Design a protein around this ligand. Structure first.
Ligand SMILES: Nc1nc2c(ncn2[C@@H]2O[C@H](COP(=O)(O)OP(=O)(O)OP(=O)(O)O)[C@@H](O)[C@H]2O)c(=O)[nH]1
Ligand SMILES: Nc1nc2c(ncn2[C@@H]2O[C@H](COP(=O)(O)OP(=O)(O)OP(=O)(O)O)[C@@H](O)[C@H]2O)c(=O)[nH]1
Ligand SMILES: Nc1nc2c(ncn2[C@@H]2O[C@H](COP(=O)(O)OP(=O)(O)O)[C@@H](O)[C@H]2O)c(=O)[nH]1
Lengths: 431, 430, 22, 430, 21
């Protein structure tokens, strides 16, 4: 009865949202036609967190798909679970943003934002109680980043107290897809710092590394990356949907994770990610799950935790589990890696337990870590943005959209200040 | 005639209440449907004309999931549907959220139902408040409810069976914060506060019951056994009857000092049972063992001020007198110089009932030793620095500020806890 | 512990100073 | 011998009369055909030589639809076809339309049929006028009928069960206007006016009956139960019999102050029933709770002047005396300094009958607490500014003027309601 | 070091209060 309003933005956001809704429908026993086919009371007990009931047994996702070009959501509708979404929740433009955050935020986003907020308000007003909004999108893209930041600002203005959750696909370190990724990321991070209450960072190269090393897949398409992201998205909120021995809602996770308002960026990971060959060979135990969680390779962010220090870390376990086992494992990890954990926080672990594991898995565990390691990700973004902005390459595309040059400097200053605060709390000594 | 109103606040409160009410239903023969196939149930149950017995309890939570678990589980036809009170938004481990913004209407409705319950009681020994010091629902809403109860009901004895954060192991981050806040709140409202630690009960289950994977169900079963032993004198007759009012008079030396350690004995599994005598002296020694205490607090560091023993089963006053004489003559146990007696023995002829499917074995004798001792200042010393370590950087302070708190509230709470430390030192020293 | 006690005392002194300034 | 004539004016009047007469038929065993397979029905029904019992009621409305629903429904062979009086054109929420132009011939025929009823009654306890303050039919025609009844019958007790507009929720726009007009009219004609609010009864249904979608049928059933409890002492014997003439003498201190709040207890569904004992003390406390009050007016703001209790079922005078003593000792309940007793208790041995298809459970005890208190001035204070805010712009005034009204009538009604406010303040003050 | 520095801060605040008295 604590509803969540899902929003997908851009091509990557729409694909991630489609995969996420496929996964959630699979978990809740929802067929592509909307009818419940789960044969489980617990699936329907808290289905209202994501779905609303239709005239019959049909369940419509509380999702809003947003884009400036119709091709992405045409593909979404052609997908296996494209028919669950209400056709009114597809808000599309006609001319897509050419990877231009200025186009997606000021010129072409201004017209579509009214319809987007109309749909968002219509979905929110139907909710009995609203935990918040979750926006899945990709930094480094025109329509995605632009429309997402604009909508996040609008929703923050309309619903200040409500929780705001962000799944941002930050551009990868080594191989960049588009050239204007540093501009788009720098402009979007400035908005996310001020508006998004909780923001979680994903990198495609980190996803590729984890799916090639742990899953040991040979030809990983974007579908598999979306599968991992969707697994994290489901596992973060399974405590709202299922009974838990020690449940923790999104607001509880945010309170236990965020020490100071600006330091709300998190890296996430899902366990157990097991290769098909070693599925039988691996033992599903609490220590094994914790060991896989705390591996640097398991992190879905490019930034590696060993360089930084863990400010906080929430761990949401799923399955019939021993709270003593979980707590002892968390304490043992903190004691063993006390160098990597902040000294001025006595306990850096927020453990939550849910009694319902995902289908097929006896046990599972999602990890959400606020660590100063993300400082290096922001620093790399700065090293690219400053270098390209010095020569003002591709600046005229943003300038012709009615964007002042001073906005770039302000965004860079904000992101550098965030880096500075991360470093200050990384090297902060108690007393 | 000896009615006691039970309040269960937060996830921990409701989960220990599940075990407590299962234990009471088993003890009094009440089926989960509500009725049983004299008048000893009147302490915890009020009977209707239909013959069905309904508990005098109130399940309070700002989260709906935990209460809906009870609404769906076996005890769905036992409890009163309106007595189960559920919120809409969880406190999110924010004492401010549970005490200033969300908790207002919920606690108002809680007072309404508590009033309906108290109007149905001829006598009223007091309230049994079971919450979790260290969570927004438990800390904030429980503190607000206790404040309202102190305002309106007045001199009724409120016994807070609080669960405090463990020294090293924990599950939350702002737990020292809201623990300090709740401690400042309940220093002046509850009459007797019983301290409990999950780490201590986990250790108990590991070494005694030989459970290598203890869980909250086992912890709550042990706590329920402790509370049943505490209340057994109200429901079942026996030599040396003890009362709820007698707890404070024999146990609280000064109004500020009312936090108490609890230890149940024997804690033995079904497998190793009936292998030793389990005599009165042995079980008393086991109860006084530092390991058996349900708080991570070595009693050897401090000095016992008062010790109330609740004996259950085939126990004779001479046996308890000899056992307490041996305990006094024991040199490891050290008492304060100003309390030459320091002992309150109370026996009952009802042996502890064993929950089927539990790990405890059927023992014909049992001891619940609840002690006021100055050693408990150690746990307050631990929370006093676990708090101040974050409060130096003002970490997570904005979260509490957002729901109507000030830095002054944290300052006042922390100063009050330091004053409590000083008072513990003052009473402990001659 | 003594540090944070003296810090709360310092905070109270600062609040008193601000009130005096008002 | 104890006949009471029922009048139902307007849509609300007829729709509450449907529930009332269904309840009376169920209570007295009258099948909807008209006859049953003593003389307790004489209060509400007059028996014919053939054995068919016809109610002493009159359904008055200027709209044919509501009356035709009764003429077509199950109760078509019960009521007198000419007693069902139907108009041609609706009053269109216009007090002037219902009081000056359309209502004339209708009220003439109404007095004719009312005289024919009164000629068939040996005794006559009074009139029960059920209308809707806030609509042309109920307000205008009802006021005109009340004036004519006061002129011709004289001292007969007219009890008006009016449904006033709710504070915030409403269904009409000129409801403040015609409500003020009708209140000015009925201040000087009715003997005891009982206030009812749709918002308050909706709250009662939502909280007590757990109905998330309350409707007019539910509201009318609650009103019918209240009126049946009010009339129970006329039809069924019991200790402490209370009469219609006794209502005013023990309830109306001054002729102007005769507006009174109503509260029924218990209001519990079948599922929630037999979870509580439902003792006399508990039901009395529930009746005195502001939430159970059938008017959106917190009694804590004012002071109680008189409280008449109608108990139904297995109630003993000792229990009612203990309950009323507890109420008097209660600090929250505040009475006027000039009324030391302020209580009129009356018991009856007939439990309230349950309407099949309703939500109320079969309870062996029932309380109807009808109170004169100075808090009621608050609703008049709400309507007094709701009126003048519109009246400053003279909005919708031409609609009233067209059917034979003047600005002087509005001014006089507003000044009269202000005088009523002043009277309530003066009676409340020492 | 931090204790002595912040104690000096306390002493300065107390002296300021006394001066303002
Ligand atoms: N002994 C024991 N402690 C428990 C149990 N369940 C929860 N706890 C403790 O209770 C604390 C949190 O309780 P709650 O405040 O009620 O959690 P909640 O219901 O989600 O409410 P908030 O967290 O305040 O929003 C945790 O830190 C646990 O240590 C239990 O079953 N047994
Ligand atoms: N409590 C309750 N109130 C009702 C019910 N039916 C109607 N009302 C109220 O009655 C008022 C209007 O009644 P009427 O005047 O009789 O409506 P009408 O029959 O069309 O006549 P006019 O409105 O005057 O033209 C509305 O404002 C409603 O609030 C009912 O079933 N229960
Ligand atoms: N994980 C994942 N990432 C994607 C997908 N599609 C695109 N991306 C990445 O998202 C980044 C930004 O693209 P995007 O913002 O969606 O383009 P836009 O929609 O036109 O704004 C690109 O660099 C892609 O590498 C997908 O299906 N899954």
């Amino acid at each position: 009865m604590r509803e969540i309003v899902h929003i997908q933005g851009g091509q990557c956001g729409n694909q991630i949202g489609a995969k996420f809704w496929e996964v959630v429908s699979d978990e809740h026993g929802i067929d592509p036609t909307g009818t419940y086919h789960g044969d489980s009371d617990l699936q329907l007990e808290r289905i209202n967190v994501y779905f609303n009931e239709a005239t019959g047994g049909r369940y419509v996702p509380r999702a809003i798909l947003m884009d400036l070009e119709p091709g992405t959501m045409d593909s979404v509708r052609s997908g296996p679970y494209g028919q669950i979404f209400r056709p009114d929740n597809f808000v599309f433009g006609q001319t897509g943003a050419g990877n231009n955050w200025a186009k997606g935020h000021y010129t072409e986003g201004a017209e579509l934002i009214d319809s987007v907020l109309d749909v968002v308000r219509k979905e929110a007003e139907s909710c009995d109680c609203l935990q918040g909004f979750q926006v899945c999108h990709s930094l480094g893209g025109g329509t995605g980043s632009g429309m997402g930041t604009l909508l996040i600002s609008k929703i923050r203005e309309e619903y200040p107290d409500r929780m705001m959750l962000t799944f941002s696909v930050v551009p990868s370190p080594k191989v960049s897809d588009t050239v204007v990724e540093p501009y788009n990321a720098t402009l979007s991070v400035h908005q996310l710092v001020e508006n998004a209450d909780e923001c979680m960072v994903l990198d495609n190269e980190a996803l590729y590394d984890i799916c090639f090393r742990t899953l040991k897949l040979t030809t990983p398409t974007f579908g598999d990356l979306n599968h991992l992201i969707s697994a994290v998205m489901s596992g973060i909120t399974c405590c709202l949907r299922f009974p838990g021995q020690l449940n923790a809602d999104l607001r509880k996770l945010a309170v236990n994770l965020i020490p100071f308002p600006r330091l709300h960026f998190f890296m996430v990971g899902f366990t157990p990610l097991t290769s098909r060959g070693s599925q039988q060979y691996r033992a599903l135990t609490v220590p094994e799950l914790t060991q896989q969680m705390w591996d640097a390779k398991n992190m879905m962010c490019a930034a590696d935790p060993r360089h930084g220090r863990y400010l906080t870390a929430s761990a949401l376990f799923r399955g019939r589990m021993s709270t003593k086992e979980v707590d002892e494992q968390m304490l043992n990890v903190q004691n063993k890696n006390s160098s990597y954990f902040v000294e001025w926080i006595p306990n850096n672990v927020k453990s939550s337990v849910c009694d319902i594991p995902p289908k097929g898995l006896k046990m599972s565990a999602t990890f959400i870590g606020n660590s100063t390691a993300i400082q290096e990700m922001f620093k790399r973004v700065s090293e690219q943005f400053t270098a390209m902005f010095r020569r003002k390459a591709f600046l005229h595309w943003y300038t012709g959209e009615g964007m002042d040059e001073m906005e770039f400097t302000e965004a860079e200053s904000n992101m550098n200040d965030l880096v500075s605060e991360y470093q200050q709390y990384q090297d902060a000594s108690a007393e | 005639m000896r009615e006691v109103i039970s309040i269960h606040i937060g996830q921990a409160g409701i989960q220990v209440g599940n075990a407590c009410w299962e234990l009471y239903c088993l003890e009094h023969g009440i089926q989960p449907d509500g009725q049983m196939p004299d008048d000893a149930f009147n302490t915890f149950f009020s009977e209707t004309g239909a013959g069905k017995h309904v508990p005098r309890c109130i399940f309070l939570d700002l989260e709906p999931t935990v209460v809906d678990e009870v609404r769906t589980g076996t005890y769905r036809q036992l409890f009163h549907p309106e007595q189960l009170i559920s919120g809409k938004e969880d406190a999110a481990n924010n004492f401010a959220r549970g005490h200033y913004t969300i908790g207002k209407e919920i606690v108002d409705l809680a007072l309404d139902r508590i009033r309906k319950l108290a109007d149905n009681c001829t006598g009223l020994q007091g309230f049994l408040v079971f919450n979790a010091v260290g969570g927004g629902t438990g800390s904030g809403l429980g503190s607000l409810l206790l404040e309202r109860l102190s305002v309106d009901y007045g001199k009724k004895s409120k016994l807070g069976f609080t669960v405090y954060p463990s020294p090293q192991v924990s599950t939350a981050v702002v737990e020292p914060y809201n623990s300090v806040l709740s401690t400042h709140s309940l220093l002046e409202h509850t009459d007797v506060a019983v301290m409990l630690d999950n780490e201590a009960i986990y250790d108990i289950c590991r070494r005694s019951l030989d459970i290598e994977r203890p869980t909250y169900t086992n912890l709550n079963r042990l706590i329920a056994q402790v509370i049943s032993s505490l209340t057994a004198s109200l429901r079942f007759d026996g030599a040396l009857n003890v009362d709820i009012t007698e707890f404070q008079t024999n146990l609280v030396p000064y109004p500020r000092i009312h936090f108490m350690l609890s230890s149940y004995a024997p804690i033995i599994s079904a497998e190793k049972a009936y292998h030793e005598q389990l005599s009165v002296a042995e079980i008393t020694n086991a109860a006084f063992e530092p390991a058996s205490m349900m708080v991570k607090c070595d009693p050897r560091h401090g000095k016992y001020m008062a010790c109330c023993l609740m004996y259950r089963g085939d126990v004779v006053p001479k046996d308890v007198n000899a056992s307490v004489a041996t305990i006094k003559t024991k040199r490891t146990i050290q008492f304060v110089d100003w309390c030459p007696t320091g002992f309150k023995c109370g026996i009952n002829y009802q042996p502890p009932t064993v929950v089927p499917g539990g790990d405890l074995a059927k023992v014909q004798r049992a001891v619940c030793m609840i002690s006021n001792s100055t050693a408990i200042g150690e746990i307050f010393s631990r929370l006093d620095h676990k708090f101040d370590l974050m409060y130096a950087k003002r970490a997570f302070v904005h979260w509490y500020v957002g729901e109507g708190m000030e830095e002054g509230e944290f300052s006042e709470a922390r100063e009050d806890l330091a004053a409590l430390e000083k008072d513990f030192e003052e009473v402990g020293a001659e | 512990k003594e540090k944070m006690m003296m810090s709360l005392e310092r905070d109270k002194l600062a609040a008193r100073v601000d009130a005096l300034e008002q």
